[PDB]
């Protein structure tokens, strides 16, 4: 159904199952099927595609040439009524594509909230980005990436399949990331490599300065003690006893599937 | 004309004397030229404009906000009535661009079938596309491009003008290729080196143990064995005549303008 | 007001308020703004967004899927009437974006005449492009950026925001320019760094033999010199007074703000 306070231009076509909620406003020459579900507030504002199993929140911001939803490019996809998930108040910009997710991925492409993907920022198939994230210009991720909360993936930066994004991370532009990139870390270059906190954005955030030096400490564990990985973990563990931003690095462990970025 | 069993939606502009075929599908807000010719189901799903004069297959799947046959980036044009060519079965996804020919470049722009053109590839002018090829997000080909059957284009990766990217070849993400890369090797980086024989894509189409070893017998020939190119061009050429799937070194080679990435 | 002799095809949506030149053609499902002008002979060609406080001149072509004076990126901005100005005969390819500036950088993006912007190219909030331009496919400036006359910026590079890439500058695909970029240079590398002089391009635009003998020169100054730029400042100004292209590195420096590159 569409509320009676939503706004639909003339020339954009809803098809008849499509849920737009309160206040919401779909522009000019928009496209949004049946399966698709957009939250009070939200606003497409011309030549948007949405399609697929496509939830989509309250207050988000769509521009021109986005297509929501799509079918993803997976060779192994087949047409299987997979899912796109997005939170409230992200503003994403011309040309993004967020794709939905495969059967064998989990059939789930998840995007959260206050959240800014620039100009042809691509989400494939399976990903998870979080809160807060920045994905700049032409950011592109494979599929089954995650972006956790307040990471930031650079101009230009494409993320090979399977990786996971630290919370807080910061990639630099014109970058490849191959492998994982624990929280917290800077990552530039092609391929990605570490190059210490980033402090910068911690601070903006709020992080305290204890906090600061615990999560430099554990840096330092993984990638200046010389010891393993396998070595440092109850280390890191230990100080997040006493530090619990630190228990991000062991969270993130448990997910880390292609080695850490070094 | 248009083909009786053809569905052009009402919002879309197909110009008198574009040809459509049966079972074909174009979608809201497509503008088709007067000089294109759509082939037998064939969809355009939304937001297409196909224009010059531009030949399109069988069963091909073009996706919203591409531009298919437009006036190509090179400043040497002057509106001549250059060509497209596409094949049947291909994929070509949202924002890819294929451009028209030049008269200096033999005035014609090529794609073959079952291809996988992924968002905002570029097909510049006097291209010459393969089939069954993969080019990633982003991946963007300067003018008088060689794509060869089989070969893979990493997401974020351009190829300089006039160079060949040989059969079955696959070129990393986020790279850059300057000159031209033989039959079945590896590429990446910035710009572009050899990374050995593409072993597990040839696994994967069908390639005896016996082709392979020869193949990579030919890449030693070329890059390990420190002789010239010339001195080993009838050793790669004696070869071929026992394994058949070597001939594809020769056939490179006499095509070959800008040299071996090395 | 609406030329007499202007086409506004019956699908695209022209606000009240929006100037629109003689003879300019708005193509099939284009928007324009209601604080747009667009000059005389200007052509867009389907599917664009123009909108904001933005003044396009003459003779310009802009193709489908482009933005034009849409909100920046910058979270700073807060919806202020800030502008766009475009200056005439310029080809601004699909997908190009070019954003209105913020009242902390000024307030104004610009772009001047005879300039081509391939395919989604991005001029960021508050950026500065020259006349006789080309930014490749997918060239992304981040905010502040000035781009100078007759200077190439290659496919795929992305330029770090407040930087200046000066005159007749080439940068090379695939680059990461992070500081400034002094007229006549050659620019490659992620990040980029100098390789000599843009000799070419300066013989190809009607510059004498003498000239570039100075320019070359200027450059050996800089880097080859082994001394400061602060020492050869005066040296490079002395030169100007016999070779007035010279000046052009003179008031380059004086706009610099983050180093050069190296
Ligand atoms: C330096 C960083 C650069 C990063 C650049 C990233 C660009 C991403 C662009 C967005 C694409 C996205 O929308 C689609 C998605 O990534 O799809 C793929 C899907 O996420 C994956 C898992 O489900 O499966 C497919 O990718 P792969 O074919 O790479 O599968 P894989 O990762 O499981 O295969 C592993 C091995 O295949 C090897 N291989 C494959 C083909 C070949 O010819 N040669 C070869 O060696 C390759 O070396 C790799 O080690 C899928 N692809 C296709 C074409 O079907
Ligand atoms: C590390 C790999 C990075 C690859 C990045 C590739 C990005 C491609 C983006 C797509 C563009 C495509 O759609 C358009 C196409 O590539 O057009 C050109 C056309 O294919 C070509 C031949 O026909 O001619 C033109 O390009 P060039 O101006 O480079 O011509 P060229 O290759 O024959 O010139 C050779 C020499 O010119 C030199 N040059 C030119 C200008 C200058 O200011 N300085 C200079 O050195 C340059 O160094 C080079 O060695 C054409 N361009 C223009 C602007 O007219
Ligand atoms: C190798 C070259 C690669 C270049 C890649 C360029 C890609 C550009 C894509 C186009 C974007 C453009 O349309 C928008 C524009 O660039 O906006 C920004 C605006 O031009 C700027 C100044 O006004 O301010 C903002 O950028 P920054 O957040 O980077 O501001 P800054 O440059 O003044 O901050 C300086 C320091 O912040 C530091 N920082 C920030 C966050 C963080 O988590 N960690 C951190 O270290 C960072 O290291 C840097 O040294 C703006 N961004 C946002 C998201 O608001």
New binding site residues.
């Given amino acids: 159904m569409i509320d009676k306070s939503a706004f639909v231009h003339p020339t954009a076509i809803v098809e008849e199952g499509a849920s737009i909620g309160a206040n919401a406003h779909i522009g000019p020459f928009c496209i949004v099927g049946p399966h698709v579900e957009i939250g009070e507030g939200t606003v497409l504002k011309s030549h948007v595609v949405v399609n697929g199993h496509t939830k989509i929140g309250r207050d988000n911001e769509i521009y021109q040439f986005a297509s929501i939803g799509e079918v ?6 087949a047409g299987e009524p997979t899912r796109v998930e997005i939170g409230d108040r992200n503003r994403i910009r011309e040309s993004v ?1 967020i ?1 939905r997710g ?1 059967v ?2 989990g059939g789930l492409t998840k995007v959260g909230s206050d959240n800014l993907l620039m100009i042809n920022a ?1 989400i ?3 990903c998870t980005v979080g809160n807060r994230c920045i994905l700049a210009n032409n950011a ?5 990436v995650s972006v956790d909360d307040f990471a930031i993936i650079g101009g230009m930066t ?5 990786c996971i994004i630290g919370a807080h991370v910061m990639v630099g532009g014109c970058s ?3 492998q994982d990139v624990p929280p917290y870390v800077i990552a530039q270059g ?3 490599t570490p190059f210490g906190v980033n402090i910068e954005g911690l601070k903006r955030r709020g992080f305290s300065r204890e906090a600061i030096t615990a999560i430099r400490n554990a840096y330092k564990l993984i990638y200046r003690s010389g010891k393993t990985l396998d070595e440092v973990k109850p280390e890191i563990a230990e100080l997040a006893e006493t530090y619990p931003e630190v228990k991000a690095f062991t969270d993130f462990f448990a997910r880390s599937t292609r080695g850490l970025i070094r």
Same sequence: chains 1, 2, 3.
């Fill in positions: 993803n490019q997976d060779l192994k996809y594509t794709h495969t064998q991925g691509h494939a198939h399976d592109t991720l494979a599929g089954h494409a993320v090979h399949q399977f490849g990331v191959a092609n391929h990605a």
